[PDB]
Design a protein around this ligand. Structure first.
Ligand SMILES: [Zn+2]
Lengths: 233, 9, 227
C-alpha cells in the first residue's frame, strides 16, 4: 500500500483542472501551472494517501463497515467491481438523496425491494397480467440501480470512501452530521474541510481512479486477512 | 527518487 | 498434478479451530493464527502427488477404488465424482461391517437387486395392498447407502475418505483386512491407519471438489493407460 511516487505520475494524477474552476483552499497541494492548469504536488499527495490506506486497514480489522460512492458512469462501474471483489458495499450514481438519516425510511425501502426480488420468481408466474408484469420489472430496475449495492448492509455503515467529493458535497454533509469518518479524492475544485483524510488526487481519466480503487481494495483485504488468517502455505 | 521538477520536465 | 495456486484458492490450508486438534498432526501444520490452525501446504502437495501416483498404479491392475463421504455437504459431491471414473461410492453412513462382515452385506445386496428389478419391471404394482409401498420404500432406504457398491466390489484395493475422524469406522475395518486407505485428514483427525496421508481441509465445499477432481482424474487415466 505504498504506490510508487512514479506510477501515479504516468497515471495522470498530476493534471488538475484550470484556474477558472479551482478551489482556492487547495493551495497547500500545488506545484505550478502547466498550460495554465494546476499540477497537484505529488510529494505532498503521497504520504496522505498511504496514511489513509493504513487508517482504512485498521478499520477493516475492527470490522467497521466501509462504503464507496458512484460518480461518472465509468467511475461507477469501476467502484462496483472493486467493492464486490471484497465487500464494503457500494453506491452507484445518485446517492438516493438523504440516505443517511432517512436510513430508517430507506430501510423500509430496502425491505420492499428484497421482497419484490423474492416475489420476482414467485408473483411473476402466477396472476401475471400484461400490465402488472411491466410494473414489477420497471420498478425493480429503478430501485436496484441505486439502492442495489447497499441493500446488503442491514445497518449503519461505519466509514465512507467517496471520489472527487465536490460532485457529492451532499454526501459529506450528512456524514459530518453523524461522526461517520470519510475519505475523498479531492481535486483542485473540491472543498476538503469536511473530509477527515484528504486524498489530493484527480477524479479523472479513470485510469488514475482505478489506481485509488485498487489501492484501498488491497488494504481492506488485509483487514479480512486479520479477520481470516495470516499469510502462509 | 528523482526530483518532481526534472520528472515533469 | 495439482499446484499450490490450485489449493490456495480453494482454501485447503484452512484447518479446524485451535481447541479441537490432535497434537499428532502438528508436523502437517504450519503456524496457527487467529485461533485457527493453518496447514503447511508446502508439505501437502508432495504427499498428495505421491498418493496420486499410487492411485494410478492401482487402476492399472483394474482394482476397485471406493470413495467414502458421509458428510452431508460433500456427500452429493462424492456421488458425482465417482460417476465419471465409474468407481464405487458411499455418500451415507458407512454401515458397520461394510467390509469385515461381507457375507451378511452381500446377501443384503442380493436382496436389493432382486427387489430392484421386480418393482422396476412392475410386479410390485399389481400386488399393491400397501405391500407395494413397503417394497418401494425398502429399496429407497437400501439405495440411500448400499447404493454405489451394488455391482459387487468385494474387498476393494483402496478407500478414499474425505474425513479422517467421522468415518473412523471405515478407516478401521480396512486396516483389519490390510486394504490401503487414503484420507483428506484435517487438523482435528487422528493420523492413524491412514497409511498414505494427505493433510487437507475436509469441510469447505470448494476444497472437497478439488480433491475429488484430481483423484477421479488419475483413476481414469490409469484405466486408459492399461487399456
Ligand atoms: Zn477532475
Amino acid at each position: 500500500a505504498t504506490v510508487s511516487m512514479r506510477d501515479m505520475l504516468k497515471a495522470g494524477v498530476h493534471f488538475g483542472h484550470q484556474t477558472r474552476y479551482w478551489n482556492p483552499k487547495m493551495k497547500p497541494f500545488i506545484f505550478g501551472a502547466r498550460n495554465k492548469v494546476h499540477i497537484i504536488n505529488l510529494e505532498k499527495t503521497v504520504p496522505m494517501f498511504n496514511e489513509a490506506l493504513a487508517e482504512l486497514n485498521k478499520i477493516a480489522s475492527r470490522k467497521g463497515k466501509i462504503l464507496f460512492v458512484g460518480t461518472k458512469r465509468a467511475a461507477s462501474e469501476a467502484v462496483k467491481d472493486a467493492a464486490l471483489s471484497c465487500d464494503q458495499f457500494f453506491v452507484n450514481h445518485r446517492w438516493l438523496g438523504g440516505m443517511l438519516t432517512n436510513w430508517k425510511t430507506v430501510r423500509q425501502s430496502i425491505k420492499r425491494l428484497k421482497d419484490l426480488e423474492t416475489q420476482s420468481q414467485d408473483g411473476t408466474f402466477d396472476k401475471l397480467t400484461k400490465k402488472e408484469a411491466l410494473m414489477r420489472t420497471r420498478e425493480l430496475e429503478k430501485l436496484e440501480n441505486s439502492l442495489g449495492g447497499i441493500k446488503d448492509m442491514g445497518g449503519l455503515p461505519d466509514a465512507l470512501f467517496v471520489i472527487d467529493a465536490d460532485h457529492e458535497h451532499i454526501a459529506i454533509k450528512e456524514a459530518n452530521n453523524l461522526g461517520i469518518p470519510v475519505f475523498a479524492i479531492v481535486d483542485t475544485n473540491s472543498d476538503p474541510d469536511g473530509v477527515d483524510f484528504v486524498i489530493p488526487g484527480n477524479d479523472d481519466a479513470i485510469r488514475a481512479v482505478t489506481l485509488y480503487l485498487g489501492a484501498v481494495a488491497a488494504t481492506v483485504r488485509e483487514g479480512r486477512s486479520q479477520d481470516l488468517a495470516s499469510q502462509a502455505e | 527518487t528523482e526530483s518532481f521538477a526534472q520528472l515533469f520536465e
